[PDB]
Structure formats: structure tokens, C-alpha cells
Homo-oligomer: A and B are copies of this chain.
């Protein structure tokens, strides 16, 4: 159920990793992925290895949760490629519209929250 297949980063070609991402992200596959396959295939496999290290096939959180965390982060940090990728990832996993919209509301709240958290020095002088 992971983004890339069991042990795919251990392959002797970048093909399995690339195929799984194209397959699981569809139109949301970042433009940089095919470019890595072509110009830095080792870095693409390292990308897959690192992804799996963080999110093992049978880990602490389910795929829904992992995807929504990644989606929230992408939105809060303004990573267009990651927002598109996780939105499509979520669609293919069949995550619900209500869950995706709540994630969006949460990312929006988080950014607002951070401003207040950074406001102490200002509040102190009022």
C-alpha cells in the first residue's frame, strides 16, 4: 500500500520506483521525478529509500494519515509540486472529500496559529 513497492529502492534500475510513483501519483507526479530518472537515477532510488524509511509498509500510522500529514505540510509550506502530488495520491486512495477539506482547513489554521505564536515580542510591548 506504500507509495513504492517492497524493496524497490534496492533494485538495479530505477524503473520500479519510477513506475510506482507514476502509477500512484498519476497527473500529480512532479516534473522533477522523470528528470531524476533520466539524469540522477541513484538520487531517485535514494528518494524512494528515504520515503520508505519514514513510512514503512507496516508502520505506526496508516496511509490515510500519512497522506494527510504530507498534504497539510505541502499546503502550509507552499510546495506546489507536493500539494499536487498528495492531492492525487489522496484521490487514488479514495480519501473522502470531508477529510481532504478538513485537512485544508487545518493547514490554514496552522499557518494562522504560527503568526500568533511568533507574536509574543509584539504583545509584550502593548
Contacts and interface: CB of A to CB of B under 8 A. Distances in A.
Interface of A: 28, 30-33, 35-36, 39-40, 43, 46-47, 50-51, 53-55, 59-61, 65-66, 68-88, 90-91, 96-126
Contacts of A110: 69-70, 73-74, 77, 79, 82
Given A28-B121, A104-B43, A76 B76 contact: yes
A108 B116 contact: yes
A65 B98 CA distance: 14
A121 B87 contact: yes
Contacts of A106: 54-55, 61, 66, 69-70, 73
Contacts of A74: 110, 114, 118
Nearest to A26: B125
A66 to B, nearest CB: 6
Contacts of A78: 77-79, 114, 118
B81 A32 contact: no
A47 B98 CA distance: 17
Nearest to A101: B40
Nearest to A56: B102
